[PDB]
């Protein structure tokens, strides 16, 4: 049976999983979404006239950067318990990644839902970003608003974009980043807890190698790329489990570890799932992770196919949308970017 | 039906295929092996007490280097018509690659045998080096003699090794190499006939990328790694054919082109099959190509298995061995390195 999110507004508990120092935690664990008297409705494919074109974060136009910055400002200015707010959007990640929900609807009220460390990883975050993007656009009345994406697979895109830097006057800034690494600028997609002492050009090549590893060498079929099978009745797969898919375990994990501030108790913000969403760059890193799924399929190598297992196809989550409506979304419906009305600007 | 070499001492003709400028050729086209009145014996697996451990050319012990150099000197000192002589060993490549033999033993006396550009590539060169290596060891009384291999998949092994340089006093030297490239030292495994003009470190990273391309991205199954099916009655597959396997067409071809001297009429020596064997580095390049077969299997990826088609297994060649006996060898019998009593020193 497929993993099925419950009525997240009725069955939810404070996050208590996968956070090593909770007494010292600098972000809240009260990650449950607000109740607004809404009924959960099924997703319907969007009627957008145009496809939203996500843009490399190092090559944005003035309008792209300004709109993104203004949308994040608007999101930050919302009351916290507005489901569209900066805090609410961060909390989504916390609730789904750190034990807010159970498998009660599947007959396992005693087992939490975890969307990481399995084949749920790619489609959960695709949907998370889908609504996030639509919410941001709605806040600035831009019906074709598109996220930037951190193109760390392209040399010039590897430095964290200066749009995220500066101080708190910049809505895209977050003080809770590794200061040494921000100074270094170039992300280490192979970061394993110790700084490489290598030339920038070598790090660029290392990052290129890492993308090759995640997309070709280790991602040779759906199990190894998307991650292991995870169905109702299954306990949560541990961080670092070898059954985790290549991108999730690889480049994905590295960027989180590298940006997260090691002086913080749980390496907040990016260094733990529960806090990662308080860093605006979280979503923009994840936009390129989302793109990796696209690229992986474009390679047209043996085994580079989407999942057809019904227990994956029919897995579902619940999100607030830009209308503060509750939407149930299914893995099967996010495999086709054209139907979700967004894509990525390529070379 | 399998490709089957004839009695090479009875049916043989001068090489006249694949050589663009025959009249200006700086090496011989009369590549037929000598006649000593020997019968052709069936292969017997070797009873070597120790496994021959082929050593990276850039990190040999003093004994490894001195033994190799002395063995080549001894090989160059042999009478020309000794089938073990330097030129006789070079001629083997010429005969099997440039039209010395026909498929007479298969009932096709007017069709040439070609061992390149097909699934015969790897096993033919494996056997060729097997006897070459045993011959060298026998000339200096080193029963456990092993060849070096040009480890151009490892950064410090990418420069052509100093042991091949100097001038005519060095048995390992060959004047017919691209002087500009010998100056550059670092081989370009992605060489397409145009110098890249990039930083050494970049070329190193490119070479590593090229190895992953040949072994993982393009060598996805036996057809794409080993090359196309080639059986009795087939005409020679043309250089550049899309059916050529990934290593043969990729890194393998690149090293030949890069080392070969473009000021020579057929880019002798390494730049044409018929002359490649006059460059000692030919065999040492090919020892690493041989190693790629091993590595490709060790990747433990779907499709990375040996050929089971009888028309490949039962294909055979004839070589002189270290005792000047004629030996017929089959593809099926070279798939296991333990049984051939050699391997490669790894990190």
């Amino acid at each position: 049976a497929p993993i099925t999110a419950p009525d997240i507004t009725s069955i939810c508990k404070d996050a208590s999983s996968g956070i090593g120092n909770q007494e010292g935690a600098i972000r809240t664990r009260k990650c449950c979404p607000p109740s607004l008297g809404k009924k959960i409705k099924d997703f319907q494919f969007p009627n957008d006239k145009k496809v939203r074109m996500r843009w490399p974060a190092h090559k944005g136009t003035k309008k792209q950067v300004d709109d993104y910055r203004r949308a994040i400002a608007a999101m930050r200015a919302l009351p916290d318990d507005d489901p569209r707010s900066f805090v609410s959007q961060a909390k989504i990640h916390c609730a789904y990644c750190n034990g807010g929900y159970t498998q009660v609807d599947s007959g396992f009220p005693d087992i939490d839902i975890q969307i990481h460390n399995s084949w749920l990883f790619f489609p959960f975050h695709r949907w998370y970003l889908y609504f996030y993007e639509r919410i941001l656009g709605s806040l600035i009345d831009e019906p074709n608003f598109a996220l930037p994406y951190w193109k760390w697979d392209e040399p010039k895109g590897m430095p964290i974009s200066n749009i995220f830097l500066g101080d708190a006057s910049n809505p895209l800034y977050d003080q809770y980043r590794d200061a040494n690494h921000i100074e270094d600028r170039i992300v280490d997609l192979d970061y394993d807890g110790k700084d490489k002492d290598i030339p920038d050009q070598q790090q660029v090549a290392c990052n290129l190698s890492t993308v090759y590893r995640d997309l070709v060498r280790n991602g040779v079929d759906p199990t190894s790329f998307f991650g292991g099978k995870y169905v109702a009745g299954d306990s949560p797969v541990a961080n670092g489990d070898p059954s985790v898919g290549s991108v999730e375990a690889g480049s994905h994990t590295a960027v989180h570890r590298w940006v997260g501030d090691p002086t913080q108790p749980n390496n907040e913000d990016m260094g733990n799932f529960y806090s990662a969403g308080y860093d605006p760059v979280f979503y923009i890193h994840h936009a390129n992770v989302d793109r990796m799924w696209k690229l992986w399929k474009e390679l047209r190598l043996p085994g580079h196919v989407d999942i057809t297992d019904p227990d994956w196809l029919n897995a579902s989550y619940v999100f607030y949308d830009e209308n503060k409506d509750l939407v149930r979304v299914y893995n099967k419906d996010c495999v086709n970017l054209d139907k979700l009305k967004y894509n990525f600007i390529e070379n | 039906a399998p490709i089957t070499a004839p009695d090479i001492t009875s049916i043989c003709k001068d090489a006249s295929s694949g050589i663009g400028n025959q009249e200006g050729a700086i090496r011989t086209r009369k590549c037929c092996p000598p006649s000593l009145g020997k019968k052709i014996k069936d292969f017997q697996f070797p009873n070597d007490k120790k496994v021959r451990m082929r050593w990276p050319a850039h990190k040999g012990t003093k004994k490894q280097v001195d033994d190799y150099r002395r063995a080549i000197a001894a090989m160059r000192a042999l009478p020309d018509d000794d089938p073990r002589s330097f030129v006789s060993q070079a001629k083997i490549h010429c005969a099997y690659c440039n039209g010395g033999y026909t498929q007479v033993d298969s009932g096709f006396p007017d069709i040439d045998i070609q061992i390149h550009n097909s699934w015969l590539f790897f096993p033919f060169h494996r056997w060729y080096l097997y006897f070459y290596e045993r011959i060298l060891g026998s000339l200096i009384d080193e029963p456990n003699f092993a060849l070096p291999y040009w480890k151009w998949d490892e950064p410090k092994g990418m420069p052509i090794s100093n042991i091949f340089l100097g001038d005519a006093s060095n048995p390992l030297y060959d004047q017919y190499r691209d002087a500009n490239h010998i100056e550059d030292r670092i081989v370009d495994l992605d060489y397409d006939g145009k110098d890249k003009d990039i930083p050494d470190q970049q070329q190193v990273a490119c070479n590593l990328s090229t190895v992953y391309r040949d072994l993982v991205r393009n060598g996805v199954d036996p057809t794409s790694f080993f090359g196309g099916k080639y059986v009795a009655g087939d005409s020679p597959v043309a250089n550049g054919d899309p059916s050529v396997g990934s290593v043969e067409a990729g890194s393998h071809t690149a090293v030949h082109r890069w080392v070969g001297d473009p000021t020579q009429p057929n880019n002798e020596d390494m730049g044409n099959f018929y002359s490649a064997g006059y460059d000692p580095v030919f065999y040492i390049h090919h020892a690493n190509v041989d190693r790629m077969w091993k590595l490709w299997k060790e990747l433990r990826l779907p499709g990375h298995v040996d050929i089971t088609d009888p028309d490949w297994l039962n294909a055979s060649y004839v070589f002189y061995d270290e005792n000047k006996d004629l030996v017929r060898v089959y593809n099926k019998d070279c798939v296991n390195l333990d049984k051939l009593k050699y391997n490669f020193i790894e990190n």
Binding site: C206 | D153, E154, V204, V211, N347
Partner: peptide
């Protein structure tokens, strides 16, 4: 083989 620019022995 498996030497990459990420490795310290590179």
């Amino acid at each position: 083989v498996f030497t990459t620019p990420c490795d310290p022995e590179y």
